[PDB]
Every structure is written in structure tokens, then in C-alpha cells.
């Protein structure tokens, strides 16, 4: 994983964010982006029990509700009322 997939990551912009623990700026892509041992998975549809079937772009199926809908893996799930860690 990357900082970007961590719960401790603080979003800033489309290229970088902060590590909550170090308070230092960390990249999303590239050199320096990989997860550190203190990693704790950030809640996302990609890691929800209700999330399934994604296509090459991460677009798949939410079954959170009886009526299925589409959802995207990098969608933040920390404020989804139906989110369930897989």
C-alpha cells in the first residue's frame, strides 16, 4: 500500500497529502509513496464487504442496499453508513 491507502493520511491535493503521524508531506505516486509499518487501512469502497465486481478502472458494484448500484474503489468510505470492513 501507499500513504494514500492509509487511515493516517491527511488529504491535501491531487499530488500529495500529510502523514498524520510524522506531519510531513507525502506523495501519492512514485518514489516515497509506499506504506510504512505503522500503516492502518483507510476505509474505502475498494475495501468494503459490500463492494464487488470492479472493472479495470476500479468501478464496480455496491450491494450495501437491496437495490445494487455502482461505486468506485478509491471512494472514501469512512462516512458511508453501510460500510463494512471486508
Amino acid at each position: 500500500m501507499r500513504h494514500y491507502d492509509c487511515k493516517n493520511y491527511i488529504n491535501l491535493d491531487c499530488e500529495k497529502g500529510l502523514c498524520a503521524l510524522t506531519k510531513g508531506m507525502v506523495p501519492i505516486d512514485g518514489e516515497g509513496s509506499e506504506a510504512c509499518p505503522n500503516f492502518k487501512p483507510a476505509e474505502k469502497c475498494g475495501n468494503c464487504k459490500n463492494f464487488c465486481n470492479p472493472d479495470k478502472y476500479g468501478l464496480g458494484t455496491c450491494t450495501g442496499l437491496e437495490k445494487e448500484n455502482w461505486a468506485y474503489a478509491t471512494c472514501g468510505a469512512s462516512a458511508c453508513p453501510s460500510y463494512k470492513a471486508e
Partner: protein
Amino acid sequence: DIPEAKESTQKLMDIYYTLKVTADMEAAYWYNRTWWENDGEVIEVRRAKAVAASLSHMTPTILPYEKLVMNKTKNVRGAFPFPWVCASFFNAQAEALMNEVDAPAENEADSVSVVGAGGGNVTESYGNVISIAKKFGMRKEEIPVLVKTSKPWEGISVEELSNKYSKMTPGYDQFKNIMESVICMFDSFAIPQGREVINYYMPLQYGFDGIIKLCDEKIAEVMGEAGDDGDFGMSRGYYYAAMKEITKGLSAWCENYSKRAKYLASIETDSEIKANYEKIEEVMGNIAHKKPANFWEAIQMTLCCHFGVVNEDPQSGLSIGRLGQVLQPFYEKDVEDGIMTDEEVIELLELYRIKITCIECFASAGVSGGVLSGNTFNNLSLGGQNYDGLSAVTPLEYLIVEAGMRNQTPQPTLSVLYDEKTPEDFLMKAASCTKLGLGYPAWMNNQTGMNFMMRNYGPEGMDLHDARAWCLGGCLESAPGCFLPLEYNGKVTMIPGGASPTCGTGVHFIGMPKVLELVLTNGLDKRTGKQVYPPHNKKLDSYETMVNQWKEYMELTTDVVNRCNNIQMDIWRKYNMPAVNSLLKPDCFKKGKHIGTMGARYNSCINFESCGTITFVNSLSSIKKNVFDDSKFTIEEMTDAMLNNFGFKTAYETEVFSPDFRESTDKSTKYEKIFAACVNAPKYGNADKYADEIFKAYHYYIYDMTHKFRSYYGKPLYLCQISVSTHGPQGFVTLATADGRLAGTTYSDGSVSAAAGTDKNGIYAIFESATVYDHSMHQNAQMNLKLHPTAVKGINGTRKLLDLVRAYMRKGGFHVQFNVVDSKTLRDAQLTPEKYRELMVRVAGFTQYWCEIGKPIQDEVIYRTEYDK
């Protein structure tokens, strides 16, 4: 001297300057999902639910060092797309990317607009970041989400559905030509809320649990009952049902921040940073449900409302309004009970400028670069008169100015409602901030504003009391307000707050110089080879004939654009009505009507926007002087000279967008005589009666013209006359004008500023010219002045600057704003923008970092007349 910014403020700005303007998809994804999942629901509730979901399902972001929290999105300079309102400026781009073919060319308005490439702007894709609309970085992995979120809106966004109906107006073709020539800068659907003033009353007074109970009570009372009102009676019930839904939304959203603050505290090893997280969890936990009970909570609650509303539509100019009066009760109680010191209040006000400075407006480049230069116009107004007609200046407003001095940022711009009743010490304090050259406070005439308010809104009952509650929607769009009784701390305070919908919507910026151009070129746009207007085929045999043909084209333009923009806003208020703003804005809640159904108290807000007023008046001056009175040149001579750019190279080749530099190609001697005659004709802004009489006549005509049209709310239009950045783009598509202004170069800034380099009789002559008519006939009148810093040295210099403002205010002048800067510095910053990351100048209604302003406006600002004393 000015005290250093607080430590928190400093650390957060260090972070701020590195941030990239970022579009992401969370809000959009959730809005769209909830929307369709509720397909068939009564529209008000379906809308409310979807907005609610779009807020309360986002990732909340909290930064270390923050006391005040929340942001439009998970990103800091964040925004997101609204494909249900409009999508055309990005969906072809987006689909070109999935298909891996070339992105199509922008539309004309977009293409003639520049987003400043520096600062936070993402004007070009790089690495895994796609530049959306020449400004917003979106992560490549989201492009597919953008496409899939936007697809169900084909044919039915406000944009596309209103386009279908506009095509049935007789003037559709005319309208389309006007948009394609950029004679009309943009479509009302672009930003259907804003240029208005938010009203914080309801949650500050009730808290969300209070509000939810009020909706329960109203539902019990009226659901299923029409009273005697067969139009809207029955709709009351669905309005209260919808409000309960959006209020539940705002509550959940706050809770999400509370929970995230709680998480961050749990891992915070640094106890000091941990303290803040803990205060935040409590503050957000509290404003999720209770009436705020201290200043931090109360100010935090106004942020929840403000972010609430700017997330329900794409918009600019949602004015904060008179925050210093709205929050005075919460401030004074904290200071009294010793819960807060002033310096702690100043830290919060300092941090607050940051939060407001990071508000972005996701929209097409034409709007974001062409009009806004990226600024989102959250204008905080100060002073004026309170409910009882006495000075409204509060002690909290002094701290707002102080915060503005210590933490110098583009927003919120501060606006003094200058009133003779205002204490001298607050005026001087305000002046000492302006003299700094941040460009704020700007100065606006409280009396003239109230005068416009009584005149324009007279038919809807406007009285002296609501008139006093007015202030500036967006930059200068004088906007209705009223006072409401806030009970707090064992007393009642009438706090002010806005009371209309958008007052910067209707017929958008019409490039008047370009319309004059087309009179002279018989309807044919020579820049493009397109016949825009039906040829009039009239011999331009007199000044009166040319001006009458101008009027005829301005009236056609106004007619067709108005009818199409009514349909735009009407589709929007019917299928896309405000949820959060319908909860907040009086008298929605009391009437049981949302904004769309005229729940706001004042609905005569829709208007017509001119642009290029001085360029235009100065061209008429020149033509009348040179062609018709002195007969030194023929109208054919003038027209050829303009089409040929007086022999000079065009800004399309040189990329200099002011008089500052003309590459004097040899065809110039060919036109040197007529060019000099044009530069030399009487010029507005010199107390010259020849020019000033044309200017005056323009005012009486334009007032008369605009009030013949009717908005979708059934009210007469009136004139808004500002420029914002629009003189960039509309300048660009205009060939050389008869005042000697060259092709492609900016129009004159504002609307009562002198054209650059043509004021030669000193600032006071500008004042005399500007005030040859009564400014309250219209919404506003925009004047920029630039002072060299030496011009305002010393406390004496602060006083001299205030006396300058008083002089213009007392003549009736509506507004003046200042740059205090050395234009050579700006010239230098242009050459090497990497070296001035924090440099700001005042443009028109806004302050922006230099590095994010495009070359045309930069040039324009460089060339403005610099006053040494």
C-alpha cells in the same frame, strides 16, 4: 507595526502555498447516486436528500494545527463537478481521454480566457493528474468516475435541457451567435447561486436539532393542507420535509468531522496538536445538534452553512456578509466570561481567512479564468447602520480588520459600508489596512446602497429596516438583507443576513465595445468572419444614427439572452432548487416556499451586466469628435483604422494586453494622424463635459433599457456594472476601438475607473466625472485607483487615504478600491513569478496572488495609472 500571524496560521499557510487546486468526485458521485436512487420522489425532497448525501458521505479532512475545520471536499483547495447543472466544458474532454484520442478544442469563451499558470492552478496535465478546464487537477483514476457520473445527465442537465427550450425561442440563432462571439461572456446556468449574501440566522438561533423539531412541527401542522392557496399551499409540506432532510444532512456532516477529529486525537503523540483535535471533536460534535454556545462554535457553524451552500451548486460570490455583527453576541460573551481573550479571537479570525481563501469554484475556464481569476468572492462586509439606524460597527469588526492585517490572504475581501455615522477610529483602522496594498478593505457607499435598495425593491415592500441590512453580494452586487432576532446570552440582537436569491444572474457581461464594433462593421464580426447580427445596412450618416443602431443591437442582444437565461435559471429552480440555502434564506422557512418558488423576501434580484463601459463611452467620444462634429475623418476612415489596428501589431501576436507596449509596424504612420486624434479626443474621467455628457446619457438610457425586460421571477431587470476579470476576454475578442485602445487588449477595468493612461487631471477629476449621475439608479459602480506606496506614508498617509475615500463617498460615489503598489514591482513579478509566490494585487472586486492571474489582467493591472500624491 503589524503583529506576526499566529503559529498555527503560519504553519497552515506554509502548507497552503504548496497546494494544488484539485477536482475530485466524492460529492458528485454521492449526489448522483442518491438522486437516481430516489427517482420518483417529490422534487424538493429528492433534491434535499441528494445534496444531504453529497455532503454527509464525503471524506472529512482535518489538518494538524487547525482550530477551525471543514473544506468543500476531502482536498484543501477542493471542488467537484456538477454534471446535472453543466458538463459540456469537461465531458468531451473526459471521453476523449477514455478513448485515448485527442481532446477536442475548447469553445470560444473558454479559449479566449486565461487561467494563471502559477500558484495552485493545474493548467496542464502532468504525471497522474489531468488538468480539467485548464485549472483543476483531477487524479487520472477518477476520470472514469467522472465519465460514469456524468453520463446519466445527457440531454437533461440544466445546460442541455434549457438548451432544448432555448432552441424554441425565436431568437435562438441570434443568441447562439452572441455567445460564440463572446459578446455575452457566459450562461447563467454556470453559477446559478452566488453574488448574494448568505444568512446564518437559523442554525445560529436554533441549532440543527432545533431546526429538525421546527420541521416536525410544521409538517404536523400543514402536510396535506393547502389553506386557501391552491398554487403553493400543498407544497409547504414537501418544503418542510425537504428541510428536515437537508438539516439531517448538515448534522451528519458535522458528526463526520467530529469522528475524524476523535480519530486524529487518538493517534496524536504531540499533546499540543492533540488538544486542538479534542476541541474540534467537541466543537463539531456540538454544532451537529445544539445551538452554538461560544464563539468558536458559532463561527464554526457559519462555516458549516457557508460550505454547505457552496457545495450545493457551482457558484462564486456567496458573500459571508456582516460576520462581525452576526457574531458580536457570541464574541462578547466569550470575552466577558473570560472564555476567550481577544488574541485567541484574532487567531480564529486569522485561521478563518485561510478557510475562506481555499474556497474554489469548479466551472468552465471562461468563468474561472475569464471572469473570476480563480477568486470566489466570499465578501465580508463591515459597519453601515444597524436595525435601529445607528452605527453598526462592533468591537468584533476591529478584530476582523486586525486578522486581515496579520494574516494577509486574498479572502475574505473586506468591505466597509462607509457611513457618516461610523466611528473615526474604525474608519482609520480600516484605512490603515487598505493602505497596505492588499486591496482590502474596499469602500462602498452605505447610503447609496440603501438608496438602490429602496428604489429597486420598493415594489416588494423594502423598508428602511431591511435596507439597512443590505451589503455586497459577491464583489459589488448590492444584495437585499434583513435583520432577525437572535436570542443569546439573555438578550436579543437583530443580526443581519441576506434576504434575496442571486443578484448577479440574468443577462451576463455584454461587451459593449464589441457591440459598437459590430454597428460599424454592419453586424459582421471581423475577428472571426461570422455574421453575428442581422446587417442593419444603414449609412452611418450621423452620431445619432450610429448610437441608435448601437441601442438597437443592445436591445436585441438583451432580449434574446434574457429569454434564454430565464429558461436556464427556471429549469434550475424547478429541477434543481436550493436545499441548504432554502433552509437558511428568509422568508423560505416562514412561508414554506424554497428559493425557487420565491420563498426569499426579495426576488427582484435578476439583472443585466455591462462590460467595457469606459472603453465604450471613450470610443463614442472619439467618433463624435473626429467623425461627426469636427468631420476631420470619415466613418469609413475610422472603421478601417480600427480594423487595421491603427497599423500596430495585435495582441494576438505580441501578447501584450495593454497600451503598455505596441510593436509599431510600418503601417502605423499610415494611421498615425487618426490614431493620435483618437487618443486625443475627450476622455471620460477628466471632468471633461464632452466625454462626461455621453457617459451621463449612457446611464439614463441603460437604466431605461434594462427595466423593460423581465426576469423569470417576473421582475424588471436593472444594471449591474462591474468588470471582475471579464475585460480580459471581452477585450480579447474586440478589435481596436475608436478611443485608441488596441486589438485584443483589455477593456477598461471596472465601470467608473478612467481608461488606463487617460486620466490626466488628477483623481478628483475622476470623482467629478463618475458622479455626473446618481449612483443609486443602478446596483453599483466600480472604481479602481492605484497609489504609489510613497503616496500614503505615515499615519498622515492613512488619514489622507481616508479623506480621499470620504471625498468620493460624499459626492455620492458608490465604491472605490485601491492598489498601493509600485507598478515596476508588478512588471518584475511578471518576468519571474517564481520569485513572488505571496505577492497579491487588487484586480476588480477581488485580491489574488499574482502568480495565479493571467497575463492579460496582469498587464492590465500593471498599466493602471499610478498616483504619486
